[PDB]
Amino acid sequence: AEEFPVPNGFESAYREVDGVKLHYVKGGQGPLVMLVHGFGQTWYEWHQLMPELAKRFTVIAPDLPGLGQSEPPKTGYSGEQVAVYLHKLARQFSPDRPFDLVAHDIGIWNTYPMVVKNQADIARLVYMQAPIPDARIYRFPAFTAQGESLVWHFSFFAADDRLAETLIAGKERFFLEHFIKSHASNTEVFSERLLDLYARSYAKPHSLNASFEYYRALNESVRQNAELAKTRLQMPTMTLAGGGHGGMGTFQLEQMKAYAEDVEGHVLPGCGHWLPEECAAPMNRLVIDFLSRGRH
Amino acid sequence: AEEFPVPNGFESAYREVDGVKLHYVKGGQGPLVMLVHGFGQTWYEWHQLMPELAKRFTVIAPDLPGLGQSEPPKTGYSGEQVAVYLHKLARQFSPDRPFDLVAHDIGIWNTYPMVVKNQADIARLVYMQAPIPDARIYRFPAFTAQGESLVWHFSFFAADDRLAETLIAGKERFFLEHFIKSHASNTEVFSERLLDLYARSYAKPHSLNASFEYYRALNESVRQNAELAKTRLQMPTMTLAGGGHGGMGTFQLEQMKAYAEDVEGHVLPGCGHWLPEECAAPMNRLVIDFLSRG
Ligand SMILES: *[C@H](C/C=C\CC)[C@H](O)C/C=C\C/C=C\C/C=C\CCCC(=O)O
Numbered sequence A: 001a002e003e004f005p006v007p008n009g010f011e012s013a014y015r016e017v018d019g020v021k022l023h024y025v026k027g028g029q030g031p032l033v034m035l036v037h038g039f040g041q042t043w044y045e046w047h048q049l050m051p052e053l054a055k056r057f058t059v060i061a062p063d064l065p066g067l068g069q070s071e072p073p074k075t076g077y078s079g080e081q082v083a084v085y086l087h088k089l090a091r092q093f094s095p096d097r098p099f100d101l102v103a104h105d106i107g108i109w110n111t112y113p114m115v116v117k118n119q120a121d122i123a124r125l126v127y128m129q130a131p132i133p134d135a136r137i138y139r140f141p142a143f144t145a146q147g148e149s150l151v152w153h154f155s156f157f158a159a160d161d162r163l164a165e166t167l168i169a170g171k172e173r174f175f176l177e178h179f180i181k182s183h184a185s186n187t188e189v190f191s192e193r194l195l196d197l198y199a200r201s202y203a204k205p206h207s208l209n210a211s212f213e214y215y216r217a218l219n220e221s222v223r224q225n226a227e228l229a230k231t232r233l234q235m236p237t238m239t240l241a242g243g244g245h246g247g248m249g250t251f252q253l254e255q256m257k258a259y260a261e262d263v264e265g266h267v268l269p270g271c272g273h274w275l276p277e278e279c280a281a282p283m284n285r286l287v288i289d290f291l292s293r294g295r296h
Numbered sequence B: 001a002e003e004f005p006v007p008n009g010f011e012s013a014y015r016e017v018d019g020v021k022l023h024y025v026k027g028g029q030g031p032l033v034m035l036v037h038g039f040g041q042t043w044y045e046w047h048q049l050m051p052e053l054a055k056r057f058t059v060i061a062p063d064l065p066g067l068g069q070s071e072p073p074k075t076g077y078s079g080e081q082v083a084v085y086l087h088k089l090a091r092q093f094s095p096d097r098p099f100d101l102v103a104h105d106i107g108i109w110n111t112y113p114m115v116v117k118n119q120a121d122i123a124r125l126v127y128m129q130a131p132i133p134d135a136r137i138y139r140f141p142a143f144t145a146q147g148e149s150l151v152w153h154f155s156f157f158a159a160d161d162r163l164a165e166t167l168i169a170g171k172e173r174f175f176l177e178h179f180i181k182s183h184a185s186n187t188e189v190f191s192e193r194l195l196d197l198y199a200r201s202y203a204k205p206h207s208l209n210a211s212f213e214y215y216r217a218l219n220e221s222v223r224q225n226a227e228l229a230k231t232r233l234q235m236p237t238m239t240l241a242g243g244g245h246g247g248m249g250t251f252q253l254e255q256m257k258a259y260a261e262d263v264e265g266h267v268l269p270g271c272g273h274w275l276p277e278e279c280a281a282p283m284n285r286l287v288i289d290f291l292s293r294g
C-alpha cells in the first residue's frame, strides 16, 4: 500500500536503519540528494521537484521516523537522535561520496546535527522555513498584533498529558487544513483532495503522536545544538524562506549566517511556509540551480 | 437550575442591561463591591471571598456576558463593548456613589475601559493575574526552555475556523483540568466536583464560543486601550499576582505603574494563577484590608 502516488520512474521502498524501518521514495542517477520533509507532510511534498532533480541526481525522499510510512524511532525524537537514522540511510546509498541535503521545517531540526558532525559527507545544503533549534526560539512572541504567531504551535504540541493528541484525534483532517492554510500565502494550492491525502497519513495514531514528540524533544534539541554550534558549517549552503503570510522572511538567512561560513539566502515573495507547493516554479529552479553548481 | 451553589445570605438574580440578560450573585449591605471573574470560571470563583466582604459591603459577582448564566453580548466581545454592560450593571445598584472593583484574568480586559472612562464612579480598584491589553503582550514568548508557556493560549483561542471550539468540544472537562493545572501552583484545591461544575458551565455551546470570542477581540481591545491609556488612573489601586508556577510575578504591578498614579502591589509566593482558590485566605485578607481602609 502507498499513502501517496509515486512519480513515474521512482520506487517506493523501505530500509531498516538501527532497528527502525524507514520508508523512502527513490529515483534518478548520479550523485545523491536527500530531501527531508517537515511537520504535517511526508516525502510527497517533494514530488514535483523530484523528477526534475532526478535528471541529474539520484534522489531519495524518506519519511521522517513515525511519519508517513516510517516506523517511529527507537532512541528518541531529539534532533541528534533522529539525525543518526537519516545520516545512516543516506550513507547506505552514498557510502563513498558526499551527498546533498534539502530540508524543510522540522527536517532541518532532524538533519542539522548530522551535518555538523559529518561535514565531509555533506556536499551542499539547502534549508527552508524553520529555525535551527537554539536560544532564539525562546524569544519568538506567542501573540502578534497582525497576522498570527508562527510559533505558538510549539507550546501546543509540546504540552504534557498528550494534550494535542487528545484534542486532535478524530479531527485530524479539520486541524490539518487549518494549520496548513493559516501558514500559507497561496492557499489555493491546498485542494481538498491534497489535504485528504496528508490528513489520512498523519491520522495514523502512531504518526499523530510522533508528530508531537518532535516538539516534546525541542528543548533537548536546543541543548544539543548549543554544543554542536561551536563548529560552523563549511559547505555551500542556501536558505529559502517565504516572504508572504506564514513565511519566515529574513530570519532564515540571518540565523544561518551565525551557523555557516558560505551561505546565500532568498526570500520568495507571495509565498508562505509551504514553498514546494505554494511556489513550485521559483523554488524548484532555485534548488536545482544551486545543487547543479558542480558535479551532477 | 443554578450552575453553582449560592452562599447563605446571597441571592442569584438577573438584570437586563442594554437588552442582554446578565446573571449575578448579590449579598451584603453597604457600599458596592463588584467582583469580575475570568476565563474558565464564573462568579463562583469569588464564593469564599463574598461572605467575608458582605460583612462590610454590598457584594455583586456577575457572570461575564456569554459565560455562566449570562446572555452573550449583543454588541461584541471587545473590552470597551463588554465594559459597558458591567458599568451599567454596577450603576443599577450604586447610582449615587462610587463603587469598588475587583477583577481577575479577562475580568481586567472587560473592566479597564469603563474604569478609565468613568473614574468618578470607581472608588478603589483591585486587579489580579492578567495584563491590561496593550503592546506589552506582543513580547510574551511563545515557548520556554521548560516547555509550554503561559500565554500560547492567546493564539489558540484567537485562531479562526472555530479552532478552539472544534478541538475542545467533547473534551471540555479534559481541557479545563489541563489549563487549570498548567496555570496552578496548588492543584489540590480543585476537587473533582469543582472541576465538574466549571466544565459543565463553559461546555454550554454558546459559553464555549463566548470564552474564545474574548480572545478573538483581544487585538481590538489593545487598539482601543492605546487611546484610553492617555488618561492615567487616579483612584487607589492594588495589584495581586502569584509568585509560583502560573503566576505573573512582578509583571502585574510593573505594568500597572504605567497606568495608575496610586498603586500598591503584592506577589504571593507559593501561589499560581487561580488566586481566589489556590491562595484564598491571604488573597481575601489583602483584598478585604485594602478595600476597608476608611
Ligand atoms: C513547522 C511549521 C509548520 C506547521 C505549523 C503547524 C515547524 O514547526 C516550524 C517552522 C517554521 C515556523 C517557526 C519559526 C518562525 C521563525 C521566526 C519568525 C517569528 C515570527 C513569529 O510570528 O513569531
Ligand SMILES: *[C@H](C/C=C\CC)[C@H](O)C/C=C\C/C=C\C/C=C\CCCC(=O)O
Pocket (backbone or CB within 6 Å): B038, B039, B040, B105, B106, B129, B130, B131, B139, B140, B141, B150, B151, B153, B179, B183, B247, B248, B251, B273
Ligand atoms: C487568563 C488565563 C487563564 C487561563 C489560561 C488558559 C488570561 O487569558 C491570561 C492571564 C494571565 C496569564 C497570562 C499572562 C502572563 C503575563 C506575563 C507573564 C510574564 C512573562 C514575560 O515574558 O515577562
